[PDB]
Amino acid sequence: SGFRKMAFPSGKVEGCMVQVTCGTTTLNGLWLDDVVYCPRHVICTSEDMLNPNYEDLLIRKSNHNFLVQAGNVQLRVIGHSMQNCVLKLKVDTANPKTPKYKFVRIQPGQTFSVLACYNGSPSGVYQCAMRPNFTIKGSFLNGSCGSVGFNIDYDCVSFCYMHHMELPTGVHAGTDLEGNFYGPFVDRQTAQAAGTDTTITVNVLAWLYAAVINGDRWFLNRFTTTLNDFNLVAMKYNYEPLTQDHVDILGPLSAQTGIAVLDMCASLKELLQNGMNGRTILGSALLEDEFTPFDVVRQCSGVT
Amino acid sequence: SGFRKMAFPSGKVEGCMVQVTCGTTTLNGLWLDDVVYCPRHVICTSEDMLNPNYEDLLIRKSNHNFLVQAGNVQLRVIGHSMQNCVLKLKVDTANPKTPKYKFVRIQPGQTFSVLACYNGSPSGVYQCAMRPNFTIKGSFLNGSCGSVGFNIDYDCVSFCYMHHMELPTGVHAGTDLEGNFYGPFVDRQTAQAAGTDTTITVNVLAWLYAAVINGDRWFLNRFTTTLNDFNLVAMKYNYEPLTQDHVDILGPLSAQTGIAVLDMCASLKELLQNGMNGRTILGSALLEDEFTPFDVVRQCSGVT
Numbered sequence A, B: 001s002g003f004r005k006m007a008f009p010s011g012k013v014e015g016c017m018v019q020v021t022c023g024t025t026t027l028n029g030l031w032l033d034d035v036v037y038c039p040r041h042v043i044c045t046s047e048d049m050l051n052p053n054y055e056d057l058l059i060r061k062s063n064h065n066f067l068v069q070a071g072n073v074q075l076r077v078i079g080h081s082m083q084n085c086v087l088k089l090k091v092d093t094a095n096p097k098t099p100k101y102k103f104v105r106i107q108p109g110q111t112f113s114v115l116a117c118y119n120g121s122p123s124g125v126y127q128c129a130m131r132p133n134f135t136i137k138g139s140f141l142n143g144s145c146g147s148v149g150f151n152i153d154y155d156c157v158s159f160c161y162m163h164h165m166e167l168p169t170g171v172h173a174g175t176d177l178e179g180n181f182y183g184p185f186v187d188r189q190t191a192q193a194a195g196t197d198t199t200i201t202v203n204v205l206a207w208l209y210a211a212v213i214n215g216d217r218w219f220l221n222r223f224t225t226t227l228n229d230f231n232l233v234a235m236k237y238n239y240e241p242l243t244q245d246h247v248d249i250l251g252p253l254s255a256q257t258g259i260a261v262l263d264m265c266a267s268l269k270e271l272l273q274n275g276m277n278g279r280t281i282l283g284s285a286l287l288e289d290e291f292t293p294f295d296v297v298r299q300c301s302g303v304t
């Protein structure tokens, strides 16, 4: 029993982190096979940041201008290319610790683990979710760019995020491993305001199921609701709309606990309307939304 | 910017996890050098649990009765001994992935990372704190015993916890790596109720400093207090007493933010007395106490 904000074991990803330097800028890179992926803004100086023309800045760079260090050893760069907002540095050595991997582009509401790195060295691991406004609320300092987000399915690492920047509001923006930003963000030091950070309803419901499985049942009410009635309340509270796809995804949790999804929706509706009244659920005084229904099943079943 | 409940990168510890089986019981073991450490209750059956005599049960076990598997390969057990509540199984092969390590016994309030494992395989990593009542609030299912808690200082892993059991209230109890339980708990299926789970005051103050560093400043008040006045309020709210040692430990955070420790105490006193009023601090609606002052400095400075 017990339910924690749990990250995937980070070992497989630690074996991929390298340091990438270009001129005076140092950030992290991800070394998979004979390619090192890193944010293309590694080529920018203190001036460039404001309005960079990456293709033009890249013309002034050769393979020998990208310094890649794996541990305390230098890798030889034999090619470089820009794919969207990432640079791909071809090195002469395949990473011997390359795990089985995939590049995936996640949808808002999906969670992942982040291995925060500095100078190609891991500092910590935490669990994030892609917010509905395509930002992530991470813990990233100067030099953390190139740190990656990932999920693991047995022995295959699916990389979903690469850190690029912090918006003026302290939230984070990044790309998938093909260099495409999540959301409308651009790798430029300009006014970029995030949209509404709504609550991921399906994740809150999954976490309420986790609470019931773990013995926290005080919030269970005597009511039910419909998807349309629940959604009117959800809109009022800046919660994402709940769809039949979300109800279907919550089916296994509904089956395990014997609580119909719409009954849990009615309990969540009363929690939104009445508040917590100073009570807690799974040690939290707010409704947690960074656990997907898959995360709840995985943690409650002990998937390794 | 941003502040997350961050665990240490788990790779170094993943390379130490093995599966230990004795009879019909399988749990996790920690393989360091040529020794595998695991809970001694691996020798117990469905009957034994109630009132086990470990020395007597151990007489019926030989080296060949302990099956140790590292990955998909079997390790040869050439000796076994009981040290307090842990078994030490001497194997004929030193773990090639043994990191630099220490065994440390932590004090209440200290945090650590847990690599939850099943069948010798890592499932996830999360950050815990040793509660003032010597329990931990983990996420552990059947088969998680032998999962370990640790801190990392650059390349040295200090192991501080080994999971042994869950109390009837769903909280967890375990030992240090010398097999001594934290708190008064015993490895027996009997009535063991935990004491008061008070809040770790020095950790809450550290986290309020983290909030100020990260821009969450609404709770900063125009007051100050004394250690004795603050402590009268702390006792009333089931918070641990604050000592001059804690004030000294918070010195670097006080210096960085320019907020005297006693001023932050007065802000915490008003938060206890007035509540949050529906507001949040670092995305939390309650006062977080599982970040030590060292954790706040480490995360806010990017220690790798």
Ligand SMILES: *CCC(=O)N(c1ccc(C(C)(C)C)cc1)[C@@H](C(=O)NCCOC)c1cccnc1
Pocket: A027, A041, A044, A048, A049, A050, A140, A141, A142, A143, A144, A145, A146, A164, A165, A166, A167, A168, A169, A170, A187, A188, A189, B001
């Ligand atoms: C990794 C580099 C870095 O720390 N940061 C950064 C990111 C992007 C850029 C360009 C403008 C695209 C060239 C420069 C520097 C910062 C960062 O985002 N700085 C701007 C802050 O906006 C409010 C960084 C700092 C903290 C966390 N992540 C990144």
Ligand SMILES: *CCC(=O)N(c1ccc(C(C)(C)C)cc1)[C@@H](C(=O)NCCOC)c1cccnc1
Pocket: A001, B027, B041, B044, B048, B049, B050, B140, B141, B142, B143, B144, B145, B146, B164, B165, B166, B167, B168, B169, B170, B187, B188, B189
């Ligand atoms: C690892 C074995 C296991 O899952 N558990 C366990 C621990 C200790 C014992 C002895 C009684 C000491 C022989 C048997 C089995 C359980 C556990 O603690 N069971 C009792 C539950 O008490 C409420 C376990 C279950 C979940 C999390 N950790 C351990």
